[model samples]
Target: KKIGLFYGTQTGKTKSVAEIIRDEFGNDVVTLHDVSQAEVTDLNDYQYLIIGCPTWNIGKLQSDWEGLYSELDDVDFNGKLVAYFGTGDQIGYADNFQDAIGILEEKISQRGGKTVGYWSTDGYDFNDSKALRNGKFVGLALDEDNQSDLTDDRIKSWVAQLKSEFGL
Candidate 1:
């Protein structure tokens, strides 16, 4: 079975990143969905899921995700493994960088999902971030604003890490 990939984007950056991730997984290895159009039922088809969202101004889930937020409870994430990737500006919103991914993890955890793909926070210069836990980011955190050149390398490394963790 293929993995489920969901993303909510406003500036389109998140969608592009999602595409890169899907491509890395290869043809039909993943089913991609826009959270704006995704239903709770859409989540039931996969045991492994990859969710993406960009932190909006002042640290909030993208507007598209906000639309689907209340419906997430309708799906039970028990027996599922969910990973996250979030877009944020480390320079501008140091304290809130990638907080949206942490928020998503919290919600999924409450519904019985297991989180994976935790990334190291070693090189990040953020003062603080809700996404940080145990000296690692809850998921793959991308800072396109201050580190665009690093995105590909980050995604490649992250996807490789996930392939192992996902048992692929």
Candidate 2:
């Protein structure tokens, strides 16, 4: 089944990242949707999901997510695999960088979804984040706001990781 990938953007970074992610899953293997206009019913149609959001409100779920989040209550992720990606500026929001990934990860699990795409902190410099589990970030982390040079390579590496995790 095609994966369900969603993104919520404020400055278009999240959507732009999600678009780059789209190419990784192959044209027919993933479906892309903007969370600001989310069709929540699509949740049940796929076994894989990738959600993206840029940090807002100083490390919290974007407002777009709050509006559609409740709709996920009806979802049963008993056997689903979910992944997360977020846009944050380490230099500008070190304490809040990519924090939304953790919030989304938490919410997705509350519905019983198993998340993939854990990323390394080797290149990042953050004081702390809810997105950390054990020692890795919850998913792909992007900093187009500051580290634009790393986005392409990072995305490339992460998509390869996604392929392995999803058995593509």
Candidate 3:
């Protein structure tokens, strides 16, 4: 199935990571959308979604994501399969690493969207994070601010996992 890859970025870092995942997943398999300018209909066009957002301020979402946040309440997420990815400065915001991903995932789940692509938290060093679920991150967590070298490999594995989960 085709996937909608939506992201919100500040200073373009989040967007950069989103594109990397898209490329790894193949251009034809995933379509990118900036949450800043997309509508509910744009997201509803696909049954599967890969949502990416960065945590800002202790645990806040990137500004564009906050804009899309309220708008998503207008759509019913039923039947949608959503996976999340988030960028955070784990050192600076160790207590809130990738919290935005967890926040967004909670919203999607409340509206009935099924989620996949949970990632391991073993390699990450952080005090705490809302993104954790049963000892795993809610989705992929990337720290471009501190662990840029690990980002590519993390995305590669996550994409492979998604392919299997999506039955590709």
**Which candidate has the top score in lDDT?**
3
RMSD of 3: 1.1
Candidate 2: TM-score?
0.94
lDDT of 3 by residue, 1-168 (tens): 399999998888889999999899899899899987888667789899999999987588888888888877888889989999988988888898999999999888898789899999888889988888889898999999899999999999999999999878
Q: Give one clash count per candidate, in the order shown.
A: 0, 0, 0
RMSD (CA, Å), each prediction: 1.1, 1.3, 1.1
Ranking by TM-score: 3, 1, 2
> Lowest summed-lDDT stretch of 10 residues in model 1?
122-131
* lDDT winner between candidates 1 and 3: 3
Q: How many backbone clashes does candidate 1 have?
A: 0
**Residue 7 in model 3: lDDT:** 95
Q: What's the lDDT of the predicted structure labeled candidate 2?
A: 0.84
lDDT tens per residue, model 1, 21-91: 99998757887899888777788889999989988876888988877777889989999999999888888
Give per-residue CA lDDT, model 2, range 1-168, as digits (tens).
468888888888888888888886676787888877766776787889898888887576888876777778877887988989988988877888888889878878988999889999999888878899999999999999888899989999998999899888
By TM-score, how accurate is candidate 1?
0.96
- Evaluate model 3: give its TM-score: 0.96
CA lDDT of every candidate? 0.88, 0.84, 0.89
